[PDB]
């Protein structure tokens, strides 16, 4: 009969906003606020919410912010301008079995005069009468040792006026009318682990095959396992390093296999196989502090690369310093089967498939 206006109305809509992170690490200056000791999760009784892991701005937001932080770091580190010189170089015969090269060059000092001769080691992958790979194409910036890039867990938290909804349906395939929805203020740890073919650490399904338009196109399949597989990765070299002066306080630091747990890998595959029929970057990267690029040997022998073109970009090559002197497979990225992946958005779509951001709209009308 009459119009009644309500203010604290329990209504929300799909929305896109900026979320913030909460907890000498690279993320130390980002995730500057701790999360609450009590997540205060609220079950929403009798609701249905449409969730979609695809076209999810939280994934896109995670991606762009990580790239930004990555680039905020490095920016203040030493620029390796004077390494683009002709390098003289020979082989290694010293207790080497079936590599690394023994190289030397003319380098600057802290003064503009008195150029010095320097001897250093390089991995074959980084050397192209030699030049360093891409030295004449892109600037190379070293990743200075004062900052750690260890992928600590992070939590995304809503700004005031927004809330994060979560899907608790154990059989959710990434899209659709999820029930048993709960509301949270912050996401779980979504540890920012970077990989290609296999997804490491993160969380388990406690197997679920999730993909967009499955069997119909050239799209990645994200497989989340109910059980983890431990992989034993090492670098049995006991490398040492040489610290030299490039310039006035400009320091440069000059200068492998994985054992897949036996039997359990075949059991894991056993869980995946014949589930696909219900519907129906050549290597596996890592970061141990070094980038392994391992072969899929007995999976469907690693090689360290020091000059890195990451995030699929060309002009921002990074120089990883040498390091003086144990991961879980929780999911796979497959293509029609062979390993797929290489797109960081899919790497980070995983673990966020269950979350949605909505805007709270505290105003509404009803009759009385």
């Amino acid at each position: 009969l009459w119009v009644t206006v309500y203010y604290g109305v329990p209504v929300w809509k799909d929305a896109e906003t900026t979320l913030f992170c909460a907890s000498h690490n690279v993320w130390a200056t980002h995730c500057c606020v701790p999360t609450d000791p009590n997540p205060q999760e609220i079950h929403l009784e009798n609701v249905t919410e449409e969730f979609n892991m695809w076209k999810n701005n939280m994934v896109e937001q995670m991606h762009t912010d990580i790239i930004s932080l990555w680039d905020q770091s490095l920016k203040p580190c030493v620029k390796l301008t004077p390494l683009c010189v002709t390098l003289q170089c020979t082989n290694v015969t010293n207790n080497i079995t079936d590599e690394l090269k023994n190289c030397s060059f003319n380098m600057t000092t802290e003064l503009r005069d008195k150029k010095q001769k320097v001897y250093s080691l390089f991995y074959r992958l980084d050397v192209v009468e030699y030049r360093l790979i891409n030295c004449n194409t892109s600037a190379i910036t070293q990743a200075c040792p004062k900052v750690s890039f260890e992928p600590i867990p992070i939590h995304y938290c809503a700004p005031a006026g927004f809330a994060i909804l979560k899907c608790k349906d154990k059989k959710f395939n990434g899209t659709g009318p999820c029930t048993n929805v709960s509301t949270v203020q912050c996401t779980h740890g979504i540890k920012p682990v970077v990989s290609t073919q296999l997804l490491l650490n993160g969380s388990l399904a406690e197997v679920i095959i999730r993909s967009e338009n499955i069997t119909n196109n050239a799209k990645n399949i994200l497989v989340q396992l109910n059980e983890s597989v431990q992989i034993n990765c090492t670098r049995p070299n006991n490398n040492t390093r040489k610290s030299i002066r490039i310039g006035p306080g400009q320091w440069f630091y000059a200068t492998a296999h994985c054992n897949v747990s036996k039997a359990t890998w075949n059991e894991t595959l056993g869980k995946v196989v014949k589930q696909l029929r219900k519907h129906f970057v050549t290597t596996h990267s890592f970061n141990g502090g070094e980038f392994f690029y391992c072969n899929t040997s007995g999976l469907f022998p690693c090689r360290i690369k020091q000059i890195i073109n990451m995030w699929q970009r060309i002009g921002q090559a990074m120089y990883a310093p040498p390091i003086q002197g144990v991961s879980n497979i929780t999911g796979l990225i497959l293509t029609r089967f062979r390993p797929g992946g290489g797109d960081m958005r899919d790497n980070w779509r995983s673990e966020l498939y269950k979350y949605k951001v909505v805007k709270i709209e505290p105003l509404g009308v009803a009759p009385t």
Binding site: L1, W2, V3, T4, V5, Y6, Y7, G8, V9, P10, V11, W12, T17, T18, F20, Q40, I42, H43, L44, E45, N46, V47, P159, A160, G161, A163, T183, Q185, I360, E361, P362, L363, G364, V365, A366, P367, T368
Partner: protein, 103 residues
């Protein structure tokens, strides 16, 4: 910290302060805080232009026109959630705002 969920309209009438109190609590974050303030103020100004202020529940002398929803009072108020109601009347809202502003 909204738990009304699928509870029907009128069940959430006692949680209105739960939602209201949750609204007020590098450059991107400064911008975000300013925007949160602006959102809050726009809703308060809007209630203020209408014939009320400082209320969780407001009822001014604007009659209901059933053309907006072909349901009776029991049919609208009960057996429905606020989310469902808002969808059914996602249109015919700006007109109410105008009538409320006029009175």
């Amino acid at each position: 910290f909204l738990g009304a969920a699928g509870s029907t309209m009128g069940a959430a009438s006692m949680t209105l302060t739960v939602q209201a109190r949750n609204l007020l609590s590098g450059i991107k974050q400064l911008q975000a805080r300013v925007l949160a303030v602006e959102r809050y103020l726009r809703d308060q100004q809007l209630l203020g232009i209408w014939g009320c202020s400082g209320k969780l529940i407001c009822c001014t002398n604007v009659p209901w026109n059933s053309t907006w929803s072909n349901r009776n009072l029991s049919e609208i108020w009960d057996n429905m959630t606020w989310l469902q109601w808002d969808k059914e009347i996602s249109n015919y809202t700006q007109i109410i705002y105008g009538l409320l502003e006029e009175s």
